Design a protein around this nucleic acid. Structure first.
Ligand SMILES: Nc1ncnc2c1ncn2[C@@H]1O[C@H](COP(=O)(O)O)[C@@H](O)[C@H]1O
Ligand code: NA
Ligand SMILES: [Zn+2]
Length: 180
DNA sequence: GAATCATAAC
């Protein structure tokens, strides 16, 4: 099929769709995640095209910080009275093109969370904190990732709140209810 | 039987 129509290009289409946009400014857009893995999940994307964190440099440091500030503002404006915790960050190896910041609530209550890969992509070191990425760009000038990131996706299921080991996704989902 | 897992998408 075409390059423009390839599945990996889908964020470039969604980020221009008014029905998916929840915030816009001169630098970034925020969209709803199409397949949210928790009750709240947004993606913050720059208007300017940066393929992934592999292409980030110090010229982008202000932009990464702005993406983070905007993510925090979206939490306040859309979920400020929630008692939910949020994390902001980046998958160590993304699938979709165009750099994007995840802003995700920590309930992980969603039918789109279906497998161990989903769980571990948000609940191991595969999920890079936004602040950590920012500080790496500031101090080292680029984002690097160590070997072994795909292997993290195969780790046994473990609750992020209490560290209990769970044997299946259904049993993890039942367990997570206690932390609401 | 339920759930996981690797593989496939031309
Ligand atoms: N067309 C889309 N619009 C919005 N979010 C999307 C779309 N396609 C995939 N997603 C989400 O984009 C993210 C891509 O994951 P990653 O590349 O690992 O950061 C996932 O959270 C998906 O649910
Ligand atoms: Na992938
Ligand atoms: Zn727990």
């Amino acid at each position: 099929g075409s390059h423009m129509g390839h599945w990996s290009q889908g964020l470039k289409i969604s980020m221009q769709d008014p029905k998916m946009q929840v915030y816009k400014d001169e630098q970034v857009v925020v969209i709803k995640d199409k397949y949210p893995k928790a009750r709240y999940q947004w993606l913050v994307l720059p208007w300017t095209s940066i393929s992934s964190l592999k292409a980030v440099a110090r010229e982008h440091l202000e932009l990464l910080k702005h993406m983070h500030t905007v993510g925090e503002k979206v939490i306040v404006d859309f979920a400020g009275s929630s008692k939910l915790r949020f994390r902001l960050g980046y998958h160590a190896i993304p699938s979709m093109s165009h750099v994007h910041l995840h802003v995700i609530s920590q309930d992980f209550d969603s039918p789109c969370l279906k497998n161990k890969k989903h769980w571990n992509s948000f609940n191991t070191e595969y999920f890079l904190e936004s602040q950590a990425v920012i500080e790496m760009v500031q101090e080292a000038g680029r984002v690097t990732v160590r070997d072994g990131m795909p292997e993290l996706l195969k780790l046994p299921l473990r609750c992020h709140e209490c560290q209990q080991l769970l044997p299946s996704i259904p049993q993890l989902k039942e367990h997570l209810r206690k932390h609401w």
